[PDB]
Amino acid sequence: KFPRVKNWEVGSITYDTLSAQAQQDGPCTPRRCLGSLVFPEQLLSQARDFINQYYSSIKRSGSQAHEQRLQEVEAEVAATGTYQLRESELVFGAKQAWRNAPRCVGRIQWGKLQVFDARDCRSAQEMFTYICNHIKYATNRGNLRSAITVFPQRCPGRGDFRIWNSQLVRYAGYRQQDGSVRGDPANVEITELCIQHGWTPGNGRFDVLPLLLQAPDEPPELFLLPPELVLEVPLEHPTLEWFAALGLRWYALPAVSNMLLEIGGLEFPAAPFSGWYMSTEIGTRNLCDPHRYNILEDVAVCMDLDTRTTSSLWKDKAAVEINVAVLHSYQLAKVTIVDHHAATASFMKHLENEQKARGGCPADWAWIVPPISGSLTPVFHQEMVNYFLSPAFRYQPDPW
Amino acid sequence: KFPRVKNWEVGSITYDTLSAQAQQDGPCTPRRCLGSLVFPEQLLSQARDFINQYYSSIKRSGSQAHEQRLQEVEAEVAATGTYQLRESELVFGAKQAWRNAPRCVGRIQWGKLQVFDARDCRSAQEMFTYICNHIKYATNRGNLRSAITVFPQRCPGRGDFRIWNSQLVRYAGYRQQDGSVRGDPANVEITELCIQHGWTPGNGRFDVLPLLLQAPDEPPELFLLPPELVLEVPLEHPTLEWFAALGLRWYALPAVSNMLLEIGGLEFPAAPFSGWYMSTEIGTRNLCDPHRYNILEDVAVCMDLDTRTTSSLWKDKAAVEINVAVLHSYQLAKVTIVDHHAATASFMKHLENEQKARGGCPADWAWIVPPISGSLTPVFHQEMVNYFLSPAFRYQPDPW
Ligand code: HEM
Ligand code: HEM
Numbered sequence: 011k012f013p014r015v016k017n018w019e020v021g022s023i024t025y026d027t028l029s030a031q032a033q034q035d036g037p038c039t040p041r042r043c044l045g046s047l048v049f050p051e052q053l054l055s056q057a058r059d060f061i062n063q064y065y066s067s068i069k070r071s072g073s074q075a076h077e078q079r080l081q082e083v084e085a086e087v088a089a090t091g092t093y094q095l096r097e098s099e100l101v102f103g104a105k106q107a108w109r110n111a112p113r114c115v116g117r118i119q120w121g122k123l124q125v126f127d128a129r130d131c132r133s134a135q136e137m138f139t140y141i142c143n144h145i146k147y148a149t150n151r152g153n154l155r156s157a158i159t160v161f162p163q164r165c166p167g168r169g170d171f172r173i174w175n176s177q178l179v180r181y182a183g184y185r186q187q188d189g190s191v192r193g194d195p196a197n198v199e200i201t202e203l204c205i206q207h208g209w210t211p212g213n214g215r216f217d218v219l220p221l222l223l224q225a226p227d228e229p230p231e232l233f234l235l236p237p238e239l240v241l242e243v244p245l246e247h248p249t250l251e252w253f254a255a256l257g258l259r260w261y262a263l264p265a266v267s268n269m270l271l272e273i274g275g276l277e278f279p280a281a282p283f284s285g286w287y288m289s290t291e292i293g294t295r296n297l298c299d300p301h302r303y304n305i306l307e308d309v310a311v312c313m314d315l316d317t318r319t320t321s322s323l324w325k326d327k328a329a330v331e332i333n334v335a336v337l338h339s340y341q342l343a344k345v346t347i348v349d350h351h352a353a354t355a356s357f358m359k360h361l362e363n364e365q366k367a368r369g370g371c372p373a374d375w376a377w378i379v380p381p382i383s384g385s386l387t388p389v390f391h392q393e394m395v396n397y398f399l400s401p402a403f404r405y406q407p408d409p410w
Numbered sequence: 411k412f413p414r415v416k417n418w419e420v421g422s423i424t425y426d427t428l429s430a431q432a433q434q435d436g437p438c439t440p441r442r443c444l445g446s447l448v449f450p451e452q453l454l455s456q457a458r459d460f461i462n463q464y465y466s467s468i469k470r471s472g473s474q475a476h477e478q479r480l481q482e483v484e485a486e487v488a489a490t491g492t493y494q495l496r497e498s499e500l501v502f503g504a505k506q507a508w509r510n511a512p513r514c515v516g517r518i519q520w521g522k523l524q525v526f527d528a529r530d531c532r533s534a535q536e537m538f539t540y541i542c543n544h545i546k547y548a549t550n551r552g553n554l555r556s557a558i559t560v561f562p563q564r565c566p567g568r569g570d571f572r573i574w575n576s577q578l579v580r581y582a583g584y585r586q587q588d589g590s591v592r593g594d595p596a597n598v599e600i601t602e603l604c605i606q607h608g609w610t611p612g613n614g615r616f617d618v619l620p621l622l623l624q625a626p627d628e629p630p631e632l633f634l635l636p637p638e639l640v641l642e643v644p645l646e647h648p649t650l651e652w653f654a655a656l657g658l659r660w661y662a663l664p665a666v667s668n669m670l671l672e673i674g675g676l677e678f679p680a681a682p683f684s685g686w687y688m689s690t691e692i693g694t695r696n697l698c699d700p701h702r703y704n705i706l707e708d709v710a711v712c713m714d715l716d717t718r719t720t721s722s723l724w725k726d727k728a729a730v731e732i733n734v735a736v737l738h739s740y741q742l743a744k745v746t747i748v749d750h751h752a753a754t755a756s757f758m759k760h761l762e763n764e765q766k767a768r769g770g771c772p773a774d775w776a777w778i779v780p781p782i783s784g785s786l787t788p789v790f791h792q793e794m795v796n797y798f799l800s801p802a803f804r805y806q807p808d809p810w
């Protein structure tokens with residue numbers, strides 16, 4: 011009854027006993043697999059399970075304190091339809107959410123997460139202050155530290171706190187008259203929203219977007235991150251001298267801000283989190299995706315490669331050097347970064363740790379395997395089981 | 411409801427309506443996805459469906475001929491417990507089996523498959539002759555032609571025709587006394603079986619294995635493939651002059667021979683098929699997999715790369731040149747080969763053709779996306795739906 015999981019490189023076998031405890035249902039059915047696709051009593055049920063997880067984590071399950079807590083949660087929901095998490099439970103829940111994220115390859119670090127409690131936040135201005143403090147702590151002058159800031163939970167009588175931006179730091183995307191885009195094409199919508207809301211735009215390829223912050227039942231407010239808080243890295247190549255002349259750069263801090271944090275049935279629509287970059291996301295996805303900066307052809311031409319035929323593998327060669335540049339540049343500027351080989355190796359260790367700890371680990375193979383050199387990394391040869399566990403980070407509709 | 415399928419590079423959307431016709435069930439459930447895992451009345455229902463597919467294909471569904479055929483099959487099953495396919499149906503069925511294979515990126519050529527009827531095969535010796543003929547026809551001195559040879563179907567009260575080898579052409583794998591393996595580690599088991607049956611083993615890294623052919627209720631017979639029949643390609647690099655000295659080589663013809671062909675409830679345990687190679691399978695998987703030839707480090711050392719740290723991307727760089735070597739060598743030897751960029755590009759066209767033809771296309775994302783430079787290809791950005799349609803090629807247990 012338990013899924014057999016095999017590693018085809020070494021031949022080792024394991025059984026996922028944790029999958030049987032999946033709290034929610036995925037998109038797949040026996041008739042067809044949809045794994046490649048990107049996207050009252052129910053509250054109490056999830057609440058009780060979470061409390062059980064918490065007390066089990068501190069080795070006090072079945073204790074008087076455990077039973078008391080279960081009764082309090084039940085009492086609060088009966089009277090208000092919701093409940094208040096204790097500080098220690100929020101911290102525990104935030105870590106479990108990261109731990110449970112199937113698409114995250116950096117989970118070996120799940121236990122080291124700084125949790126900022128912003129549940130007392132009352133306005134967009136205070137939300138901005140909290141965000142700036144998160145960025146400063148997380149950036150730590152280049153020695154990045156994982157962190158999450160949790161804003162007030164969704165509740166019955168009012169709207170939600172929301173960060174409109176997809177990440178705390180993103181580059182603007184300006185649609186040009188000729189039909190092209192200057193900057194990040196992925197950010198055209200949010201850029202136009204900022205402009206619509208009062209922001210006079212810049213005209214560069216790497217303009218840091220302002221934050222569009224939303225307090226309950228109020229229109230979003232624009233806030234500009236002090237440049238001194240946004241650490242960036244100029245891109246250069248160790249041997250290709252002309253690379254530095256391209257004027258490319260990227261930001262140090264990858265901070266997702268559009269996901270919803272779910273803990274024991276409670277929902278936190280605004281809870282930005284951050285870690286550090288795995289080089290392929292910048293070097294391969296952000297810079298080489300055809301619908302992103304799309305610099306592959308230009309770099310190849312500068313490398314004097316034959317772009318006439320696909321068989322010369324000019325695309326592969328250019329992509330590799332761009333990734334080399336990203337890694338070399340971050341190391342030079344002393345900003346935390348991890349290559350795909352080192353990251354996937356650490357994930358294999360994580361799988362081992364979790365097998366012993368909980369008898370399995372929800373993992374999304376398509377997202378775990380890096381965008382380049384897939385089969386050269388250990389995770390490629392590792393079968394995985396994908397399932398939804400709670401606490402969890404979930405996608406949610408854009409506020410507009 | 412029909413699954414909504416999106417391409418994230420372009421933004422186009424389609425609905426897979428074909429998946430509702432999935433005759434068999436997969437390993438996934440709403441509880442968990444297992445997409446990354448490698449592995450009388452019922453006969454009539456499958457037979458009728460297939461016959462219906464056949465008459466629909468020639469635009470004569472509902473005809474007297476269609477009805478007479480359905481009745482003919484029913485009568486044959488009532489009298490013998492099984493039935494026989496007409497030659498035209500066999501051809502159609504084999505082509506559909508390829509068309510329906512979710513893990514095959516080369517399906518745009520499905521309609522051009524050349525099907526050879528070997529159902530009159532009486533012995534292992536006749537089987538060998540059929541196999542040699544297939545090899546000569548398919549290899550065609552380098553100008554490869556897709557083809558399949560179908561041997562007698564499985565029937566009650568009689569053993570099965572089986573080809574013990576996984577492919578018609580495989581390199582021996584010799585386990586050395588010191589624990590290492592000389593040759594292809596993937597072929598250790600079959601090599602030892604060939605030795606046990608009377609084969610005099612060689613001692614090279616690229617020794618073409620003999621065929622272990624099984625006739626109904628007979629022990630497997632050993633057969634040596636005439637060397638002039640096995641076209642091979644010596645590997646060299648266009649700029650790295652020392653690459654040729656490594657003495658690497660690979661065969662021209664990729665001919666899978668251990669899969670079972672299922673058509674309308676009938677099973678053909680022996681039905682070897684072949685096409686032509688996509689470069690990454692040789693350059694990345696066969697030569698660079700840790701559990702295969704594992705030549706990555708040796709090549710990186712010869713390239714004078716810093717193998718001390720992972721961040722220099724020495725593995726990625728070596729892997730790219732190995733793939734360049736494969737492509738260059740096959741093109742030089744004038745043997746059909748397709749790079750991963752051209753292959754994935756053609757698959758996107760195949761998906762387009764299929765959407766219009768059948769309203770969908772069963773595809774396994776994890777297998778369609780190449781082992782290197784995934785995101786650099788269009789298929790990476792394409793959501794897919796995986797399901798089992800029949801006719802089909804299925805895995806089957808080893809005869810031993
Ligand atoms: C510490 C370093 C970390 C590394 C190297 C890492 C790396 C990654 C990578 C490679 C992905 C896929 C990114 C993409 O394709 O967009 C990812 C996804 C994800 N990560 Fe991690 N991560 C780290 C920290 C964190 C932290 C601190 C959290 C949460 C507290 C987290 C939560 C997630 C989630 C929820 C996803 C899925 C995002 C989605 O579905 O779009 N990660 N991470
Ligand atoms: C014409 C050129 C062809 C190309 C470039 C091609 C390419 C591929 C590739 C890259 C794979 C997956 C990787 C692997 O082999 O392990 C594959 C799998 C497969 N191909 Fe194709 N193929 C071709 C022709 C054919 C033909 C003629 C048939 C059958 C009539 C076929 C049947 C299959 C099947 C059933 C699989 C799944 C194999 C498995 O599960 O291990 N292919 N092919």
Ligand SMILES: O=[N+]([O-])c1ccc2[nH]ncc2c1
Nearest residue numbers: 264266284285286287288291
């Ligand atoms: O999702 N994330 O927060 C996240 C964290 C770290 C990362 N490195 N590279 C991509 C990436 C994404």
Ligand SMILES: O=[N+]([O-])c1ccc2[nH]ncc2c1
Nearest residue numbers: 664666684685686687688691
């Ligand atoms: O399935 N096949 O016969 C087949 C055909 C062509 C191929 N290229 N690379 C792998 C591969 C497999």
Ligand SMILES: [Zn+2]
Nearest residue numbers: 038043438443
């Ligand atoms: Zn699935």
